[PDB]
Design a protein around this ligand. Structure first.
Ligand SMILES: [Mg+2]
Ligand SMILES: [Mg+2]
Ligand SMILES: [Mg+2]
Ligand SMILES: [Mg+2]
Ligand SMILES: [Mg+2]
Ligand SMILES: [Mg+2]
Ligand SMILES: [Mg+2]
Ligand SMILES: [Mg+2]
Ligand SMILES: [Mg+2]
Ligand SMILES: [Mg+2]
Ligand SMILES: [Mg+2]
Ligand SMILES: [Mg+2]
Ligand SMILES: [Mg+2]
Ligand SMILES: [Mg+2]
Ligand SMILES: [Mg+2]
Ligand SMILES: [Mg+2]
Ligand SMILES: [Mg+2]
Ligand SMILES: [Mg+2]
Ligand SMILES: [Mg+2]
Ligand SMILES: [Mg+2]
Ligand SMILES: [Mg+2]
Ligand SMILES: [Mg+2]
Ligand SMILES: [Mg+2]
Ligand SMILES: [Mg+2]
Ligand SMILES: [Mg+2]
Lengths: 70, 149
RNA sequence: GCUUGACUGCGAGCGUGACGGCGCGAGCAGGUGCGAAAGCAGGUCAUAGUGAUCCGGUGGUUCUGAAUGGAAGGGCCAUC
RNA sequence: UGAGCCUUGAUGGAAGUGUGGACGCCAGUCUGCAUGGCUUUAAUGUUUGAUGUUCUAACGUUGACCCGUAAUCCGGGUUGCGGACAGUGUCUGGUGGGUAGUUUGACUGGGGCGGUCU
RNA sequence: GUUUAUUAAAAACACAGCACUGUGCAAACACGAAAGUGGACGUAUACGGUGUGACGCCUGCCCGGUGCCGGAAGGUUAAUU
RNA sequence: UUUUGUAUAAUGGGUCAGCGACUUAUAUUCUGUAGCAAGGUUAACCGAAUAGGGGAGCCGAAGGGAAACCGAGUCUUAACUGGGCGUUAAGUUGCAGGGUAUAGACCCGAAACCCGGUGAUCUAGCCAUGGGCAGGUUGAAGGUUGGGUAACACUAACUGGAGGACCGAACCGACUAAUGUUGAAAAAUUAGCGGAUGACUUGUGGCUGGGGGUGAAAGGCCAAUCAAACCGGGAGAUAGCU
RNA sequence: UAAGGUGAUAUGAACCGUUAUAACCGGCGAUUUCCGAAUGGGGAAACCCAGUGUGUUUCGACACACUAUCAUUAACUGAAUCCAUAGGUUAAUGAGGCGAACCGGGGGAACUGAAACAUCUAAGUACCCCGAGGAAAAGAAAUCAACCGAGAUUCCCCCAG
């Protein structure tokens, strides 16, 4: 709903029947939530997927640091 | 993809291998519970260094002690004295604690370990081919001679 | 019987329309067919048989082509 | 279980006995055991897909406990059931008067109906 | 019994009864972007939706059309590669 | 005023007084007038501010062609002819006016749509907690006892007290007629009328919000408003109509 | 600064002032009940009720001060589990509410126009919401230009309807 790391959420867009309509739409992202820190205990968090990777890319732990200074 | 190891895992994944892994590399297994990976650019920078540096500590055992046979086999034989009576039967028996100390004074604190010695010899006076080894691939055949003081 | 004038490029001057537009047209240029030749032929005896624009499709052309050479795309001509 | 690889046996090396098997041009190979002198296809593996079966570890739990806490909420922990299922995001086909915006011509002895429209 | 407060009290709405249909419980269904709540602190002798409207004797033929229920072998067919 | 046409019995006005409708901005084009002239003129800005400075730039003295391109010519065509459009038309910048364009665009006026708030002190449902129902009837089930049966059915007195039960005040409701209709009253009064222990009736407070609620269903009710409430806004909506 | 004054309807009364300290004007300070973010709990705003302190006390007890939530840190504590977290207590700091336009950001109509209407228009406007400042925002080229070169952003005139 804000994705703890690489924060994202409900952007708005519109629809397109190609024929007629431009009804507004609305996005979101991805819910989901895992993580378990091998430096203490399994802290978890709700993050997007493309948000999980990134952390799991070269953070995973090297990233909690930003939430420190939330 | 592929990742390093920290264990053995059914698949070519011996301690220290970066190959044949599956998507979502654990993070729910092989990384958290048990071994791990987070390969990255910095984590291999050290681990990968293990290939080169380990080969050194592992090379020495095959460097200094490999052909080291001469320094204990350059002589045609070692010779110790004792006591006999019959056609040269040594009462007790002279062996490791003896051959060793002797050659040790010579320059070999050799231990009675990997020595092939099938029996505490010197029981019979004369020669006795006693091969000894310090390392796996290392070993040397050295004949010994029994004499009576 | 012989043929392809159901030609290509223009057009004096007219008729008819609010306009878009529509119609008639001798004569000129290039090449045709028919006739010995004068000459006739720019579709059918004439008057109905029709759809503007836009968006595009196809072929032709060095008209243009966003640094330049190309290209895409645009124009122009022919046509759906 | 297909397809690719590509590492091996089978289309262009002589025994004597018993007997197993596979293909076989049915003048007859190849190999098991007890005893002796590159083109076509089988399989180990490896990749990649198709379906299934099992598992744990993600994910769920509107089962049971402990703690925060002399809370029905929430969270964290122990355990059981389920399990890569379900569920969600993006994209996508079908449904969709539930809901929304609209359209539904003119002439005409009033309007309609009929008929008309170049 | 109810109804058009302020021109209609009725033959209309409701009713108990009947039938069809859906729902295995985190129920179907409804309110809600969600959390959550109602259904129900109920659990198929229960809850919902539709139609008929005590009771009596009954409720015939049609599945072509539309809708719904099952099948899903074969044809056609989206994103995707 | 509107009409072919109105004394018209078609429209508007009781009368008077005050107010009440072609404006404004920039752009474009004509007309008049003024300046200058193949040239006319500056914009922002600077500023010893209406000066002076600033000529970025806009318009005209050249046009033709779709254009490259050519040029008083040029397109057209293979054409050197003809035909189309041009070629000894002075423009330009102010000022005042006629018109147009963008704007609310002479003025007044919809029924409506959209956005955000206020409303369940009426009313409709529902929740919690309290209250009301004079009097007079009928007389279910159950039960006791007598008869009766092998035993149960069954029957008779009695007791018993049921019911969206019966007549009828309070209370609740509204079927009929008269009166009222600038009323006593924006739904009542008078005489009758229906229910009146029930799906009853009522006090207090609470909960549902507008495309939403509630609805024993009439599109009914949601504050004298309901086929989509009231208030404020988009707003001078739009009005080929009066 | 001064010959006059105690605001107005508002006089009357009782006073204050007059050749160096009334009144009046300006600066700084004192006091500033209660309600209201409202902040001790509560609450039909201006009121109901409480905990811990304090002095006086005619020693009865009363008037006053502090006690909101949240965050940064620190100190002390301390579960499920060894630790360790979680959670609790305290202290100091700061924040909360209110505002005219202008500014940045999240969300975002329809009327209307197209002489109907769905693309398109109105318009990113009206409106709602968050946030900051005297200004915001922007800003020092992975810019533009054409083979010459210019040189962050910003605003005005023009290119051009
Ligand atoms: Mg004819
Ligand atoms: Mg509709
Ligand atoms: Mg509309
Ligand atoms: Mg008509
Ligand atoms: Mg009745
Ligand atoms: Mg009525
Ligand atoms: Mg009535
Ligand atoms: Mg019926
Ligand atoms: Mg029937
Ligand atoms: Mg008339
Ligand atoms: Mg009159
Ligand atoms: Mg009239
Ligand atoms: Mg007057
Ligand atoms: Mg001419
Ligand atoms: Mg009754
Ligand atoms: Mg009466
Ligand atoms: Mg009665
Ligand atoms: Mg009430
Ligand atoms: Mg009303
Ligand atoms: Mg309004
Ligand atoms: Mg508007
Ligand atoms: Mg108006
Ligand atoms: Mg207080
Ligand atoms: Mg308070
Ligand atoms: Mg319109």
């Amino acid at each position: 709903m804000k994705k703890d790391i690489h924060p994202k959420y409900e952007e708005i867009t519109a629809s397109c029947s190609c024929g007629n309509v431009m009804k507004i739409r609305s996005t979101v992202g991805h819910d989901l939530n895992l993580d378990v820190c091998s430096k203490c205990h399994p802290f978890f968090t709700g993050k997007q997927r493309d948000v999980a990777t990134g952390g799991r890319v070269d953070r995973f732990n090297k990233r909690f640091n930003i939430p420190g200074s939330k | 993809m592929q990742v390093i190891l920290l264990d053995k895992v059914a698949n070519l994944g011996s301690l220290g291998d970066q190959v044949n892994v599956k998507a979502g590399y654990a993070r729910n297994f092989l990384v958290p519970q048990g071994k791990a990976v987070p390969a990255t650019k910095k984590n291999i920078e050290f681990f990968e260094a293990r290939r080169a540096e380990l080969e050194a500590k592992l090379a020495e055992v095959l460097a200094a002690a490999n052909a080291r046979a001469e320094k204990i086999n350059a002589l045609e034989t070692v010779t110790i004295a004792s006591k006999a009576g019959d056609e040269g039967k040594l009462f007790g028996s002279i062996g490791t604690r003896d051959i060793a100390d002797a050659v040790t004074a010579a320059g070999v604190e050799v231990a009675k370990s990997e020595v092939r010695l099938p029996n505490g010899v010197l029981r019979t006076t004369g020669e006795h081919e006693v091969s000894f080894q310090v390392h796996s691939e290392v070993f040397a055949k050295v004949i010994v001679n029994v004499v009576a003081e």
